[PDB]
Structures are given as structure tokens and as C-alpha cells.
Design a protein around this nucleic acid. Structure first.
Ligand SMILES: C[S@@+](CC[C@H](N)C(=O)[O-])C[C@H]1O[C@@H](n2cnc3c(N)ncnc32)[C@H](O)[C@@H]1O
Ligand SMILES: [K+]
Ligand SMILES: [K+]
Ligand SMILES: [Mg+2]
Ligand SMILES: [Mg+2]
Ligand SMILES: [Mg+2]
Ligand SMILES: [Mg+2]
Ligand SMILES: [Mg+2]
Ligand SMILES: [Mg+2]
Ligand SMILES: [Mg+2]
Ligand SMILES: [Mg+2]
Ligand SMILES: [Mg+2]
Ligand SMILES: [Mg+2]
Ligand SMILES: [Mg+2]
Lengths: 346, 140, 54, 95, 55
RNA sequence: UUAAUUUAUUAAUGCAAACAGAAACCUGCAUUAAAAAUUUCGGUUGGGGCGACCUCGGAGCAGAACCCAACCUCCGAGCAGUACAUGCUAAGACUUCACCAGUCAAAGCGAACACUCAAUUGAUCCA
RNA sequence: GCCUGUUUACCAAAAACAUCACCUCUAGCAUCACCAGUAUUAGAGGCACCGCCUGC
RNA sequence: CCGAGCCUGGUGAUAGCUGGUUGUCCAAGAUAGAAUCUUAGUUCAACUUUAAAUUUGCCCACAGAACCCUCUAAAUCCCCUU
């Protein structure tokens, strides 16, 4: 029989407050004096970048955005490659506002083709797609692709002949299908070019070995932006405490499976929307040791310092990261938080 | 009766001591001109969200300052984590900065002594906060 | 009077109705035609990108 | 149901039955379909077709409604131009 | 549960008073359909007039 | 008591009324509080907790017509898209073990030359 | 627990309550209470005499 | 017999709860469920009873009832004869 007369009961905290307390302890030591600056940006609403849909009237949309003083940071960054001196995924146009500007883009309006003119997404989430260095004729595998923040960006490039978008949750997958349907014309999705499935990412390490040249792996993680604001399906509630404990374990397993899926000589980018170093660098180091000990697979992590300097103008970067690149949010540049690490298989 | 409602609101709704009310009116004459609703909202902001008791409000000249500047400075400090709202028992994790430091000192000094942030960052927050305040009024 | 006015109003609207249908049908084709031209223009702009590659 | 009124000592009629149901003199009770005006935009034309139909209550429901109404509602009426006049009597019915 | 589509009411242009409700996307121009009008027993143009609700 | 429902009552203001020439008392209608009044405490599961669960659908148990349970063993659904005759009518049947609901449907009229989807849903009153 | 004193008549006489002392709060005044009184007064409370104590 | 005195009245308050429910004899007569602020209850169905009408009922010969699926199961459903 249950006992309902406990002497002391733990006070009920909101899931937002629960997430805030855990982040406050962990991230204060990790970031030091930058945590108060980061914390305000996390609590403030993030800036939304307008990703131009190439399938629609991209040139006309670009002219429309220029009227709202929007500036294509991607086009500016491309010209910066030679200025500083794999390159990056081409055919991406995302317009944002100036540093410290709070203006919000109007909601997207379907064009004459019947597809949305542009997609609103975090500008920090576009970097892993750019860091992926996509090239035409490649076969791209995306794990946890739903709801399609990075999935849509791959199709805008037009460099992927075959795509494998897999997310474990069918509800997220259903959102991905609608986003692709509304934006990407049916002709591309008509064939086997875009394959949307709902299975465990751990299976991809065995079912499809060395099939894909470019693999983008965004494992699930404690989303700092969503946890501090959303009250639904928060990972920090008591019922989901078990999932948070086993969360780093899944991050190591899903990343390792994706590394097995890629062909030797291919590129794999590990992406995570969190500031916790125990889930950003340790997971990356965990997968590297896991492959060598169990499957004897060696990978090399590329240097993103060259990539860091190009987007320093429009993004804030943390210069105390062992392997990956971490983009921390700021009041002037609200994009983030985003962590992306690029490793190639040899 | 306009004066009658103001002092009665302070003595009954705000529960200020009669001795404290005399010191408030002498120090801050803007209370009479201020609307009752905004005055009550200004007081309860310090008592509940900030955690300020009755004696501290009178001594620190809280009521004289504008409501908007209080919202901008308090929320930014709260979001910075420098200011912690007192719990049920009244204890705080980190001791809060002095109330006179937040309000009496100028904006440039306010950022340097407590916020420790660049001037440009605070300017963006005010515009962001005003949008949230504007949305809050419309939603209600 | 009410029945006759409604009947006359129905007859008057139906008098212009075949012309309205043709105009509406014509506009629907034109709107698709303008988008189809944009689709070709998109290929022309993408042909410029192929020129840059070569 | 009030089996014996406090001022006349006679059985009463539940007005909920009278408003919602129609009784034919043959004994059948004719009712409407629950939900024929609710959320018609999400219902197929075939579904809406049978929602706007008048249906007969079964034996158990009909016996229930005969106890909740008095004999004034079971009498034979001769309304002029009655839409349901032809349905007040059964034809070619056996057993 | 964002309201992607809305429920709108189409009014016949023939003046017969016949109207029917259809579902359309929110971010779209007002519809102008060619639906059958039982009053005149032929297909007539319809035009959106007033939004009923959000779906 | 920051449960729900109320200000009759009390007190303080406002207006109307009523007056003087300004005011008060009284009365009516309001707004604030005060002090009270009425009523309730959903089930399911869980001895060492800081909850999960409640409706709908598929697979195993339930091996072959149907049906068949958990603390069960697993995955979901609270949509979207294309139509715009997704019009009007009508034999005969199915039916989630009742009912309420739900499903299929020849022919006919009218047009062309019973939409996809396992679930994707909410009765009456009332507005 | 300052002390004398008080309480569960009929299972608890106590460390509980009260208590001088101290503190806080409210009130500028007549004709049944407070009071035939008037801020050294009256009422509503907390603590339980007395004595001692820093940082800034 | 004071967490709200006693008495009278409303009052034969109400209780899905407990207890009780009086002569003889004979006959028929048991375990699918659904909904429910519902699982100590009730309603409907199933089952059971009486009366009445009518004609098939039960048992069951072949034939017949799915594939992805060999626990290739025991056996059902349907079913003329009898
Ligand atoms: C933080 S979201 C990333 C969304 C997307 N990658 C983007 O950046 O736009 C992580 C997603 O991974 C999915 N996921 C969780 N566990 C998974 C698993 N075991 N295998 C595959 N996907 C999983 C979840 O549905 C979740 O929506
Ligand atoms: K005694
Ligand atoms: K009961
Ligand atoms: Mg009553
Ligand atoms: Mg049935
Ligand atoms: Mg003593
Ligand atoms: Mg002594
Ligand atoms: Mg005793
Ligand atoms: Mg004793
Ligand atoms: Mg004591
Ligand atoms: Mg007694
Ligand atoms: Mg009784
Ligand atoms: Mg017997
Ligand atoms: Mg109920």
C-alpha cells in the first residue's frame, strides 16, 4: 500500500526552473564570466534567419528581403574564403539582420509555384550543413533529420542525388514530410531521391555500411533553447530523468553507427544543440575510441579554425573547445547555441 | 479624495506604516500624480518579484523612480543571474546587489559595477523587453 | 415582389455568369503560365551557374 | 418521472421526450440522428446523408418512451396536410 | 497544434443564396472556385466572403 | 486557503436624487475592500516516494470463422494533401459484443467521358 | 522554564500558557463599553525579568 | 458523551450501507459484455420466466474460408442427409 504521509516532500519546480538550475551549476564553471552573457541570450527570444528556398523565385525573394535591410551573410562569407588566405556547401542563401537588430521576418508567403518563398530557421543551425562541404552527385545520410531544420537545407543545395532522412519518432517524421511537401516540389520527392524513414539510427551502422559519402549526425540532446521556454515534453522533468541519464550513452551509439555507415574517405559532421561539454566533446571522443577498440576504425577530425574566422562577424564562437566548434548565443547575435564537429573516415 | 485614495492604498493595499507613509510623501511627491493602478503595480513588483520588504522601500526611495527603468534593470539582472529572488524562507543563494546601487547609480555605472556587460548589449535588451511588454499588454 | 426581385436578381447574375466563368478560367491558365515562365527563367539563371562552373 | 402529481394525483409527461421524439399511432417512435448539425465540414457526403434521416427507435427504447408520456400523446390526430399522416398505420404486417 | 488551414465559406455569385464551406490554407489568397449550384442546377462561380474559424 | 460561487450585509468613495447656495442626513445604482456565506475534495495503479495513467488504431497472447484480459509484450494517432458533382437521391447489408454513434452500397436523377489515409475524433442543452 | 501563579472537571500540571521587563502596531477624542479617561493615555500584539556582546 | 449545548418542529430527513422481511404444495430456473465522478451501485445486452404466434431448430456428408507466415497444433465456422 502506498504511503501518502511523507514527512518531507521535495518542492515542485517548473520544468523551466528545473532546466535553469541544472544549467546554472554546470555552465557557470564551463564558461566562467561568459555564462551571464550567454544566459540572457538563452532566456531572450532567438533571432530567426530567413533561408531562401532555391526551388521558388529565389532571385525575387532576395530582392524582397533586401528591402527589409536583410543581409545575406552566406554570400558575404563566401567572399571571405579568399580574404583569409574543402570549401563549403554551395547554393545556400540565408538572410539575417544586423548585429543587435531585433527586427523579425514576416511569415513566409507561398509563391506562384505553390511553394513557400523562404524558410525561417536558426542561423547557427545552417553552419553544420555548410561545414559538411556538400558536393554534387553525393549520397547524403541524415540521422534524426526531422523536423527538417538541416534536412531542408540539404535539398536547397541540390548536391544530393539520394537522401536518407531517418528519425525515430514518427511524429517528428510526419512534420518533416509536410515541411518538404510545402517547400520542395513533388518532382524531386517523386523518386527515390528523398527517402524518409522512421527507424533507430543504430541500425544504420549495420544495414548500410560505407554506402554514403557525406553523413550528418545530429543526435538528440538537452536543447538549452527549448528547455528554458517550452513546458511540454521537457527532458528535465522527473519522469524523463531516466532518459537524461542515458542521453550521453545514446549520443555515443548513434554517432558511432553513422561513422560505420559512411564510406572511408567520406566526411561525417556531428551536430548538437547544447552547451554541455560532457555531451559535445566527450561524445565525440567516445565514438572515436569505440570504433578503434571494437571495429578498428580510425577517423580524423578536421580543423574548423579556418571555418571559425569566416563567420566571426555574424556569429560568436567559443575558443576553448578541444575538437568541435561551439557557437554560443549573444544579445547582439542571438543565433545558437550550436555545436558542430567535422570528422572524416580513413 | 484623490489624495485620500492614494494614502489609503498605501496604508491598506500596500500596508505601509503611518510613519513610513509620512516619510514617503515628503521624499517622493510623485506618488500623488501617479495612477493608483500603476502605483500598486510598482509596489508589488518590489515586494514579490524582487523580495523587498516595507522598511527597505521607504529608505531606498523606490517609488520615485519610473516603473519602466525598474523593469529594464531588474529583469536584465535577474536574467544575468546576478540577482536571485528570495525563496519562501527569505534566504538567497548569492547576496543581491544593493537596491540603491541598481537605481540611484547611472546606467553607465550600473552596467560597470554590477552587470559587467557591454553598453551595446543592454540597448538590445531594452528593445527586446519592450516588445515582450507590448505583447504582454495585448495578450491580457 | 420579393419573389420577383430574387428571380430578376438571379436572372441578372446568370446573364453575366458565362462571361465571368470564361474570364476566371482564362486567369487561372495565365497565372499558371506566368509561373511556368518563372520555372524556365529559373533554369536560365541556373544555366548561368553552370557557365560559372565551366 | 412523477407517477402521482402533488396537485392532481395523476401521471405527468417528461417534456424532454416530447420535444426530441415523434410517436406514430402504430407504436413506432421517430427520432433524429445525434449530431446532424455538428462539424459537417469533416464528414463525408455519405455520412451526412444518413445523419439527416429520420430513424425508428427499437423495442426497448420505444417501451421506455411509452412510460414517460401520458395518453394525450398516444391519441390519433387528424392534422390537415400532415407530412407523417401516411405513417400512422402499418400495412401488410404479420406477427 | 498550429492552425495550418482555416475553414472559409464560399458564397455563390449567381445571387441564389447557396453557400458551402471549404477548407483552405491560411497563407493563401481568397479562393474563387467553380462549384455546382443546386438552385440553378449548374456549376457557378463561388467567392470567399468570411472566415468561419481556424483549423 | 492564491478551491469554486457571491456582496445580500458592513465600511469607504462616485453618480443620480434631494437641498441650500455651500454642506450634511436619507434613498437608488455602481465600483473597492472588509467580514462572512454556500459547496466540493474524480477514478486507476504504486510499502521506502517526489508519479504514471484515463479516448482512438496496428502487431504478439488469441497459431485456422468471429470474439477473448493485465501490472501485461511493442509502435503510434488528436493530421496533412488532392478534390470543388468531397452533388442530389435510393434497394439490400455490416456493425467493435447493448444503446448512441460508425461502415459499405446496385439502381435512378444530374454531371463527367462514394478522394488518399489503420487511428487523425466530442453527444445533448446552450450561444 | 526567570520567579509566585495558570491549564486538558473524568488517563497529560509540563519544557506548555501567563508573568513583571522590553519591542512593535493603531488612535487627537466626550454623556451606558474604552471613560465620567486624554500620547507619561487607551487598544491590538510579540517576546518573557535583570546583565552582556560584534561586523560595518 | 461540546471541533460546536439541550429541547421542540421541519421529520416517517436521507443512507448505492447493516440487519430483518410471517401458511402449504408443485413447476421452470446460473457465470458472454458495454457504459458509468463507475467497479459495495445502476442502465442496456446476454441469460432466465410466462403467454402467444409461426416454422424450422439442433446434430451435421462432400464442397468451401490468406497470404508475409512449416510452434507445419488441438479444433472451429459453414453444412444437405440423418
Ligand atoms: C534535437 S532534435 C534535432 C532535429 C534536427 N536534427 C534539426 O537539427 O533540425 C533530435 C531528434 O532526434 C530524434 N531521435 C531521438 N532518438 C532517436 C533515435 N534513437 N534514433 C533516431 N532519431 C532519434 C528525436 O525525434 C528528436 O526530434
Ligand atoms: K483544575
Ligand atoms: K456503491
Ligand atoms: Mg440551497
Ligand atoms: Mg451491434
Ligand atoms: Mg515558571
Ligand atoms: Mg528573583
Ligand atoms: Mg485531566
Ligand atoms: Mg494528573
Ligand atoms: Mg512561554
Ligand atoms: Mg451536556
Ligand atoms: Mg430509512
Ligand atoms: Mg425443478
Ligand atoms: Mg462523468
Amino acid at each position: 500500500r502506498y504511503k501518502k504521509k511523507w514527512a518531507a516532500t521535495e518542492p515542485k519546480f517548473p520544468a523551466v526552473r528545473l532546466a535553469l538550475q541544472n544549467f546554472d551549476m554546470t555552465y557557470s564553471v564551463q564558461f566562467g564570466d561568459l555564462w551571464p552573457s550567454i544566459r540572457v541570450s538563452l532566456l531572450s527570444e532567438q533571432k530567426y534567419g530567413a533561408l531562401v528556398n532555391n526551388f521558388a523565385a529565389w532571385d525575387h525573394v532576395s530582392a524582397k528581403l533586401e528591402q527589409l535591410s536583410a543581409k545575406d551573410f552566406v554570400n558575404e562569407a563566401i567572399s571571405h574564403w579568399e580574404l583569409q588566405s574543402w570549401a563549403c556547401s554551395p547554393n545556400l542563401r540565408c538572410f539575417t539582420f544586423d548585429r543587435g537588430d531585433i527586427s523579425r521576418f514576416p511569415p513566409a508567403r507561398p509563391g506562384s509555384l505553390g511553394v513557400m518563398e523562404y524558410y525561417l530557421m536558426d542561423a547557427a543551425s545552417l553552419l553544420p550543413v555548410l561545414a559538411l562541404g556538400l558536393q554534387p552527385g553525393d549520397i547524403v545520410l541524415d540521422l534524426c533529420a526531422a523536423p527538417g531544420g538541416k534536412t531542408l537545407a540539404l535539398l536547397q543545395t541540390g548536391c544530393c542525388r539520394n537522401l536518407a532522412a531517418n528519425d525515430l519518432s514518427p511524429s517528428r517524421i510526419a512534420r518533416l514530410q509536410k515541411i518538404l511537401h510545402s517547400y520542395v516540389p513533388e518532382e524531386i520527392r517523386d523518386g527515390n531521391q528523398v527517402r524518409v524513414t522512421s527507424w533507430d539510427g543504430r541500425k544504420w551502422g549495420e544495414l548500410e555500411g560505407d554506402t554514403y559519402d557525406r553523413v550528418l549526425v545530429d543526435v538528440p540532446c538537452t536543447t538549452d533553447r527549448h528547455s528554458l521556454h517550452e513546458e511540454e515534453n521537457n527532458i528535465f522533468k522527473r519522469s524523463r530523468k531516466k532518459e537524461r541519464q542515458i542521453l550521453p550513452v545514446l549520443q555515443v551509439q548513434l554517432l558511432a553507427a553513422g561513422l560505420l555507415a559512411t564510406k572511408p574517405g567520406g566526411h561525417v559532421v556531428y551536430s548538437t544543440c547544447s552547451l554541455s561539454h560532457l555531451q559535445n566533446e566527450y561524445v565525440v571522443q567516445g565514438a572515436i575510441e569505440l570504433l578503434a577498440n571494437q571495429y578498428s576504425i580510425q577517423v580524423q577530425v578536421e580543423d574548423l579554425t579556418h571555418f571559425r574566422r569566416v563567420f566571426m562577424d555574424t556569429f560568436c564562437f567559443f575558443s576553448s573547445c578541444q575538437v568541435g566548434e561551439l557557437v554560443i548565443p549573444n544579445l547582439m547575435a542571438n543565433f545558437g547555441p550550436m555545436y558542430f564537429c567535422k570528422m572524416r573516415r580513413l | 479624495q484623490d489624495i485620500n485614495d492614494t494614502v489609503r492604498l498605501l496604508k491598506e493595499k500596500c500596508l505601509f506604516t503611518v510613519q513610513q507613509v509620512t516619510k514617503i510623501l515628503h521624499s517622493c511627491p510623485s506618488v500623488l500624480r501617479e495612477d493608483l493602478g500603476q502605483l500598486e503595480y510598482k509596489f508589488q513588483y518590489a515586494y514579490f518579484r524582487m523580495g523587498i520588504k516595507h522598511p527597505d522601500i521607504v529608505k531606498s526611495e523606490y517609488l520615485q523612480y519610473s516603473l519602466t527603468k525598474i523593469k529594464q534593470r531588474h529583469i536584465y539582472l535577474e536574467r544575468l543571474g546576478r540577482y536571485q529572488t528570495p525563496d519562501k524562507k527569505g534566504q538567497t543563494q548569492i547576496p543581491n546587489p544593493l537596491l540603491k546601487d541598481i537605481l540611484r547609480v547611472s546606467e553607465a555605472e550600473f552596467l560597470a559595477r554590477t552587470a559587467c556587460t557591454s553598453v551595446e548589449e543592454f540597448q538590445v535588451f531594452k528593445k527586446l523587453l519592450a516588445r515582450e511588454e507590448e505583447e504582454s499588454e495585448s495578450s491580457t | 415582389q420579393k419573389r420577383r426581385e430574387r428571380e430578376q436578381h438571379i436572372a441578372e447574375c446568370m446573364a453575366k455568369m458565362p462571361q465571368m466563368i470564361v474570364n476566371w478560367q482564362q486567369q487561372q491558365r495565365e497565372n499558371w503560365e506566368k509561373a511556368q515562365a518563372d520555372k524556365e527563367r529559373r533554369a536560365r539563371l541556373q544555366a548561368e551557374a553552370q557557365e560559372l562552373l565551366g | 418521472l412523477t407517477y402521482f402529481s402533488a396537485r392532481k394525483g395523476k401521471r405527468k409527461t417528461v417534456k424532454a421526450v416530447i420535444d426530441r421524439f415523434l410517436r406514430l399511432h402504430c407504436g413506432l417512435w421517430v427520432r433524429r440522428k445525434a449530431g446532424y448539425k455538428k462539424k459537417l465540414w469533416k464528414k463525408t457526403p455519405a455520412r451526412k446523408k444518413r445523419l439527416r434521416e429520420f430513424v425508428f427507435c427499437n423495442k426497448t427504447q420505444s417501451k421506455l418512451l411509452d412510460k414517460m408520456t401520458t395518453s394525450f400523446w398516444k391519441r390519433r390526430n387528424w392534422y390537415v396536410d400532415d407530412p407523417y399522416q401516411k405513417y400512422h398505420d402499418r400495412t401488410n404486417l404479420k406477427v | 497544434s498550429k492552425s495550418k488551414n482555416i475553414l472559409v465559406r464560399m458564397v455563390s455569385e449567381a445571387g441564389t443564396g447557396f453557400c458551402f464551406n471549404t477548407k483552405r490554407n491560411r497563407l493563401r489568397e481568397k479562393l474563387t472556385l467553380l462549384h455546382y449550384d443546386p438552385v440553378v442546377k449548374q456549376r457557378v462561380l463561388f467567392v470567399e466572403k468570411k472566415k468561419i474559424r481556424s483549423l
